[PDB]
Motif scaffolding. Structure first.
Motif, short mmCIF file in Angstrom:
data_model
loop_
_atom_site.label_atom_id
_atom_site.label_comp_id
_atom_site.label_asym_id
_atom_site.label_seq_id
_atom_site.Cartn_x
_atom_site.Cartn_y
_atom_site.Cartn_z
N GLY A 112 56.33 -45.45 20.85
CA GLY A 112 56.84 -44.96 22.13
C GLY A 112 57.78 -43.78 21.99
O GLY A 112 58.94 -43.86 22.43
N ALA A 113 57.28 -42.66 21.40
CA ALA A 113 58.04 -41.41 21.18
C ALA A 113 57.87 -40.41 22.35
O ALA A 113 57.04 -40.64 23.23
CB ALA A 113 57.59 -40.77 19.87
N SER A 114 58.68 -39.31 22.36
CA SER A 114 58.64 -38.26 23.39
C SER A 114 57.31 -37.50 23.31
O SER A 114 56.97 -36.98 22.25
CB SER A 114 59.83 -37.30 23.24
N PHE A 115 56.54 -37.49 24.43
CA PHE A 115 55.20 -36.90 24.46
C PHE A 115 55.04 -35.62 25.29
O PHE A 115 55.68 -35.46 26.33
CB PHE A 115 54.20 -37.94 24.97
N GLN A 116 54.15 -34.72 24.80
CA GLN A 116 53.76 -33.43 25.39
C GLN A 116 52.50 -32.93 24.63
O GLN A 116 52.51 -31.87 23.98
CB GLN A 116 54.93 -32.43 25.35
N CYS A 117 51.42 -33.72 24.71
CA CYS A 117 50.16 -33.52 24.00
C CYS A 117 48.98 -33.14 24.92
O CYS A 117 48.86 -33.67 26.03
CB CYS A 117 49.84 -34.77 23.20
N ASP A 118 48.08 -32.26 24.41
CA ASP A 118 46.88 -31.79 25.13
C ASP A 118 45.60 -32.15 24.37
O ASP A 118 45.51 -31.89 23.17
CB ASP A 118 46.93 -30.28 25.36
N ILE A 119 44.63 -32.76 25.07
CA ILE A 119 43.37 -33.20 24.47
C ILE A 119 42.20 -32.42 25.08
O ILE A 119 41.97 -32.45 26.29
CB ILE A 119 43.17 -34.74 24.55
N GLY A 120 41.47 -31.73 24.21
CA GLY A 120 40.29 -30.95 24.56
C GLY A 120 39.02 -31.65 24.14
O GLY A 120 39.07 -32.66 23.43
N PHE A 121 37.87 -31.13 24.58
CA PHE A 121 36.59 -31.75 24.24
C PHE A 121 35.61 -30.74 23.67
O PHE A 121 35.19 -29.80 24.36
CB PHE A 121 35.99 -32.50 25.44
N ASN A 122 35.29 -30.93 22.38
CA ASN A 122 34.40 -30.15 21.53
C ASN A 122 34.81 -28.65 21.43
O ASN A 122 34.00 -27.75 21.69
CB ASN A 122 32.93 -30.32 21.94
N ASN A 123 36.07 -28.42 21.00
CA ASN A 123 36.63 -27.10 20.70
C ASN A 123 36.48 -26.92 19.19
O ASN A 123 37.48 -26.84 18.46
CB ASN A 123 38.09 -26.99 21.18
N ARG A 124 35.22 -26.91 18.72
CA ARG A 124 34.85 -26.83 17.31
C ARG A 124 35.34 -25.54 16.67
O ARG A 124 35.85 -25.60 15.55
CB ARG A 124 33.33 -26.96 17.14
N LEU A 125 35.24 -24.40 17.38
CA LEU A 125 35.71 -23.11 16.89
C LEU A 125 37.20 -23.16 16.56
O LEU A 125 37.59 -22.67 15.51
CB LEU A 125 35.40 -21.97 17.89
N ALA A 126 38.01 -23.81 17.42
CA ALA A 126 39.45 -23.96 17.21
C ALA A 126 39.75 -24.72 15.91
O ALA A 126 40.62 -24.30 15.16
CB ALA A 126 40.09 -24.66 18.39
N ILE A 127 39.01 -25.80 15.63
CA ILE A 127 39.18 -26.61 14.41
C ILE A 127 38.88 -25.73 13.18
O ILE A 127 39.61 -25.79 12.19
CB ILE A 127 38.29 -27.89 14.47
N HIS A 128 37.84 -24.88 13.29
CA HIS A 128 37.45 -24.00 12.21
C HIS A 128 38.46 -22.90 11.95
O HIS A 128 38.78 -22.69 10.78
CB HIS A 128 36.06 -23.42 12.47
N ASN A 129 39.02 -22.24 12.98
CA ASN A 129 40.01 -21.20 12.69
C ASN A 129 41.32 -21.83 12.17
O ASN A 129 42.02 -21.20 11.37
CB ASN A 129 40.23 -20.23 13.85
N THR A 130 41.57 -23.10 12.55
CA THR A 130 42.69 -23.92 12.06
C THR A 130 42.47 -24.18 10.55
O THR A 130 43.45 -24.19 9.81
CB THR A 130 42.85 -25.21 12.89
#
Ligand SMILES: O=c1ccn([C@@H]2O[C@H](COP(=O)(O)OP(=O)(O)OP(=O)(O)O)[C@@H](O)[C@H]2O)c(=O)[nH]1
Length: 317
Positions: free
Chosen positions: A104-122
């Motif tokens: 139960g920590a402080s949250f400010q998270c964003d969830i995307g769906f199939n951003n494969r290019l982002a994972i690759h440049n990461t």
């Protein structure tokens, strides 16, 4: 640049993510991973961005992605609300986004769906971080500077943090001599890998890459970065690129003369049709250049002691 490097590392150690904070975010990912695996066993929840490449400042936001290959997106949101997380589900055309804010920590998270290019440049930025220990402190300090100088607002005519990371990378590969890094995309050892219609391939065998021939200090590398974008880089003529062996690409050659905004042209290493600097307006660019010039003026000051702290002094909003 002895004294400025001393300062740089002092600031770096204050602004970087703590091991405690990182473990907290990793624990959060595991909990969210369990909510997904209980609704879709084939789906995978992967982290990308600053946190994953290790280029994150303290009190950083999370960027997550759900890999599939269809109403799973809304179902997963409903599962998270049921688990105790608070947030909203937003869908524009066929692109859904989950934006969480509690539990139960402080949250400010964003969830995307199939951003494969982002994972690759990461993956690319992760590899460079592993190649030289100077990249992580340099990127964090540039991001801290851009944030403090109010030039890190894409929705307000300036540039994204990812934009600044590519600005740092381009300088360290294609501008500084000797180079700090090679161009992994243009390596003879690189092999094509098409993901969502784009080439995401680069040389990942870092163990075989010889060490850097550049022995400059962090303080020296930063001074050069500021000096380059303040006086040498001409945004009306050139494109920041990772696809040319010399790093030389005109807007004419690219066809980015007249998404339709090309005020500041930063061509993504993989999604080459997408200008990472499309958010930058004419007035925004005017402020960015002004802050670069200010940084350069400060660093070559002849009045001692140089007030290095002013480099991270908050500018009016
Ligand atoms: O134009 C973009 C922007 C972002 N991204 C993808 O989203 C991620 C960057 O998202 P951010 O722009 O937020 O930069 P950042 O997370 O690295 O630094 P902070 O938020 O902590 O200030 C990057 O890791 C990149 O993969 C793109 O692919 N293209």
């Amino acid at each position: 640049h002895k004294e400025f490097t001393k300062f740089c590392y002092e600031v770096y150690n204050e602004i970087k993510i703590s091991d405690k904070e990182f473990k907290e975010k990793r624990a959060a990912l595991d909990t969210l991973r369990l909510c997904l695996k209980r609704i879709s066993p084939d789906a995978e929840l992967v982290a990308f961005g600053s946190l994953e490449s290790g280029l994150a400042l303290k009190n950083s936001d999370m960027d997550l992605c759900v890999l599939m290959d269809d109403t799973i997106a809304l179902q997963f949101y409903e599962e998270l609300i049921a688990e105790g997380f608070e947030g909203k589900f937003l869908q524009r055309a066929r692109i859904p986004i989950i934006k969480l804010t509690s539990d139960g920590a402080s949250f400010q998270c964003d969830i995307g769906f199939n951003n494969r290019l982002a994972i690759h440049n990461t993956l690319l930025l992760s590899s460079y971080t592993k190649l030289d220990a100077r990249l992580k402190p340099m990127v964090l300090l540039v991001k801290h500077w851009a944030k403090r100088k109010q030039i890190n607002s894409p929705y307000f005519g300036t540039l994204s943090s990812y934009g600044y990371v590519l600005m740092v990378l381009y300088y360290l590969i294609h501008v500084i001599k000797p180079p700090v890094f090679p161009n992994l995309l243009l390596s003879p050892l690189k092999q094509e890998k098409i993901v969502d219609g784009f080439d995401v391939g680069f040389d990942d065998k870092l163990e075989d890459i010889p060490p850097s021939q550049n022995y400059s200090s962090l303080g020296s590398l930063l001074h050069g970065f500021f000096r380059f974008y303040a006086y040498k880089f001409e945004p009306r003529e050139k494109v920041v690129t990772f696809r040319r062996p010399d790093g030389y690409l005109t807007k004419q050659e690219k066809g980015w003369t007249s998404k339709d905004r090309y005020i500041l042209a930063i061509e993504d290493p993989f999604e080459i049709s997408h200008n990472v600097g499309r958010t930058v307006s004419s007035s925004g660019l005017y402020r960015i250049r002004g802050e670069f010039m200010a940084a350069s003026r400060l660093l070559n000051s002849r009045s001692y002691p140089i007030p290095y702290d002013s480099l991270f002094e908050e500018a009016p909003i």
